Write an enzyme that holds these catalytic residues in place. Structure first.
Site, PDB file in Angstrom:
ATOM      1  N   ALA A  43       0.802  -1.214   0.000  1.00 46.72           N
ATOM      2  CA  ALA A  43       0.000   0.000   0.000  1.00 46.72           C
ATOM      3  C   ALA A  43       0.836   1.265   0.000  1.00 46.72           C
ATOM      4  CB  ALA A  43      -0.955   0.011   1.199  1.00 46.72           C
ATOM      5  N   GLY A  44       2.123   1.160   0.322  1.00 44.50           N
ATOM      6  CA  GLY A  44       3.012   2.304   0.301  1.00 44.50           C
ATOM      7  C   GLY A  44       3.410   2.680  -1.113  1.00 44.50           C
ATOM      8  N   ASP A  75      20.198   0.669  -7.943  1.00 33.89           N
ATOM      9  CA  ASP A  75      21.550   1.164  -8.165  1.00 33.89           C
ATOM     10  C   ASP A  75      21.957   1.001  -9.619  1.00 33.89           C
ATOM     11  OD1 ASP A  75      21.741   1.661  -5.399  1.00 33.89           O
ATOM     12  OD2 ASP A  75      22.736  -0.248  -5.007  1.00 33.89           O
ATOM     13  N   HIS A 120      24.185  -1.897  -0.714  1.00 29.69           N
ATOM     14  CA  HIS A 120      23.089  -1.113  -1.270  1.00 29.69           C
ATOM     15  C   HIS A 120      22.975   0.272  -0.633  1.00 29.69           C
ATOM     16  CE1 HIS A 120      19.649  -0.291  -3.608  1.00 29.69           C
ATOM     17  NE2 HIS A 120      18.727  -0.549  -2.698  1.00 29.69           N
TER      18      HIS A 120
END
Ligand SMILES: [Ag+]
Length: 300
Positions: A9-10, A139, A166
């Site tokens: 949902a984000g 990246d 990362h």
């Protein structure tokens, strides 16, 4: 193939879900889970797009119905503190409901949360090192964009190897390996710095009001779609991810992965490094190892 997105949902989840709904092979299934109560309707929203990808959504505290039958689990929930516990809780449910799936960790800090996920899977007794991926793809597509712009190439034609971790100094774009181009000393320094801090660009451009969600959905989608091509039997599919590899540099490390029907089919060599890249690799490894220990210690 059935793909579950946790944290759907984000910002990242909804972008990822939109691309997967429209780009997964016909006959796939997409299940969305997020604690936000809007999530069943995020799926209903997407279900109105006429592709042959069945999609349902789930909220509440129980991710099990989303994980029932899942083949791939992509985990974008969260916003160390709070995200450590979310990844741990969600991997615990993955291990109980679909332990044979491939797990893609998007929730940051990826360097650490992939270690959290590993230890939770080890205590469950179902850990498969070939099926746990730190999604570093953002990246790579960033590097492709910046190198294409600098060198006047077509963006879809440039592929930049990126290894390591990362975050920040652990992100190592291997500019020496980009075919057809060379870089001056300043260009290496500028490109490497921009790649390592690219997320900050978006934050400042959003006036501090948000983060990279749309490009992150695109990068997770690229990885998730390559993985599914491989799990359905396509060969020669190569993608980089942060995985528990041999361990020559750190316990987890991002390197090219030949993907197969069981996750990682082969960890490929990172290849030849320039003096700049070897030195950046050696300089970041203590930071990367302490990211990894932080995740191991959270669980143990
Ligand atoms: Ag799998």
């Amino acid at each position: 193939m059935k793909v579950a997105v946790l944290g759907a949902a984000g910002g990242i989840g909804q972008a990822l879900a939109l691309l997967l709904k429209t780009q997964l092979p016909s006959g796939s299934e997409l299940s969305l889970y997020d604690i936000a109560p809007v999530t069943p309707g995020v799926a209903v929203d997407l279900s109105h797009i006429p592709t042959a990808v069945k999609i349902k959504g789930f909220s509440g505290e129980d991710a099990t119905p989303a994980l029932e039958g899942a083949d791939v689990v992509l985990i974008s929930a969260g916003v160390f503190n709070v995200n450590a516990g979310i990844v741990k809780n969600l991997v615990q449910q993955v291990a109980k409901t679909c332990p044979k799936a491939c797990i893609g960790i998007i929730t940051n800090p990826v360097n650490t949360t992939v270690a959290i996920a590993a230890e939770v899977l080890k205590k469950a007794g179902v850990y498969d090192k070939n099926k746990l991926f730190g999604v570093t793809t953002l990246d790579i597509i960033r590097s492709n964009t910046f190198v294409a712009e600098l060198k006047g190439k077509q963006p879809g034609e440039v592929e930049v190897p990126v290894i390591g971790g990362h975050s920040g100094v652990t992100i190592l774009p291997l500019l020496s390996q980009v075919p057809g181009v060379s870089f001056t000393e300043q260009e290496v320094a500028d490109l490497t710095k921009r790649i390592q801090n690219a997320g900050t660009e978006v934050v400042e451009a959003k006036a501090g009001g948000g983060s990279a969600t749309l490009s992150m959905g695109q990068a997770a989608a690229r990885f998730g779609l390559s993985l599914v091509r491989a799990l359905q039997g396509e060969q020669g599919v190569v993608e980089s991810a942060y995985v528990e590899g041999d361990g020559q540099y750190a316990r987890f490390f991002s390197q090219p992965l030949l993907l197969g029907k069981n996750g990682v089919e082969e960890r490929k060599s990172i290849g030849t490094l320039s003096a700049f890249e070897q030195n950046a690799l050696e300089g970041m490894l203590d930071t990367l190892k302490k990211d990894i220990a932080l995740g191991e210690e959270f669980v143990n």
